[PDB]
Amino acid sequence: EADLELERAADVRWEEQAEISGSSPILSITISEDGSMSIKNEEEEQTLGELEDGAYRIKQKGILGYSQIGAGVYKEGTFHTMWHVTRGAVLMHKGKRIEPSWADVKKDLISYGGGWKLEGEWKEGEEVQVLALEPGKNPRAVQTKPGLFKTNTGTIGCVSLDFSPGTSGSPIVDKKGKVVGLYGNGVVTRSGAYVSAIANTE
């Protein structure tokens, strides 16, 4: 079984176009390795192809090529993703090994390369953007207003499960550019609706 491989997709920022219209292409300043950057301007899931923050796709190669199994965010020397995406596996990026540094399986989080560094705090009422890296799609910022719900994990901010499951680990940002959490920790509300927690810790 092949190692999981990282692919830089986009900068981590708030996109003002998505604040205006609801969504936007992410308009990255640094080089991207995914296919949104190419002359085709289209991501190809099966192909693959640090001093700046970035959102990454997480891919694994099989006999038919790569599949994107998730996403994560590199920030201040640490790569952050969901526990269910990697399950503790080593990641590879351009020949570099990256082993896990910390996890909280209960919160569905794992960091690689140092401790957890996502500093954003969401509070009630506040709009955020999911910087969604869906399999097969170019990076997109999507404006949303999370809900505070009562869930099986407590009373938390949640977003609707409105993206591919292979978007899990994509960063969710506030207007300051801070990462309030990651997409894709599935929780169950009191009534029984499945939603994503904004996945972060305290």
Tokens found for residue 32: 């991207």
Q: Interface with Cl ion includes 131 (CB under 5 A)?
A: no
Q: How many residues bind Cl ion (CB under 5 A)?
A: 4
> Pick the catalytic residue: 108, 164, 174, 196?
108
Q: x/- contact string, 82-121, with Cl ion (CB under 5 A)? A: ------------------------------------xx--
111 is catalytic: no
CB nearer Cl ion, residue 61 or residue 117? 117
> Pick the catalytic residue: 24, 28, 36, 168?
168
Query: What are 57's strand-pairing partners?
Result: 7, 71
Cα separation, 154 vs 172, whole angstroms: 20
Cα separation, 38 vs 197, whole angstroms: 33
Min dist CB 113 to Cl ion, Å, is 15
Stretch that binds Cl ion, among 14-22, 37-45, 170-178, 188-196 (CB under 5 A): 170-178
Cα separation, 38 vs 105, whole angstroms: 37
Are the beta carbons of 24 and 74 closer than 8 angstroms? no
SS3 label, residue 88: coil
Min dist CB 119 to Cl ion, Å, is 4
> Pick the catalytic residue: 11, 36, 84, 174?
84
168 is catalytic: yes
Question: Please, which of residues 6-35 interact with Cl ion by CB under 5 A?
Answer: none
Q: Interface with Cl ion includes 61 (CB under 5 A)?
A: no
Min dist CB 97 to Cl ion, Å, is 25
- Render 138-188 in DSSP notation, one character per residue: --EEEEE--EEEEEBTEEEEEE---S-GGGTT-EEE-TTS-EEEEEEEEEE
Nearest to 142 by CA among 182, 172, 166: 172
- Residues noted as catalytic: 84, 108, 168
What residues line the site for Cl ion (CB under 5 A)? Answer: 118-119, 178-179
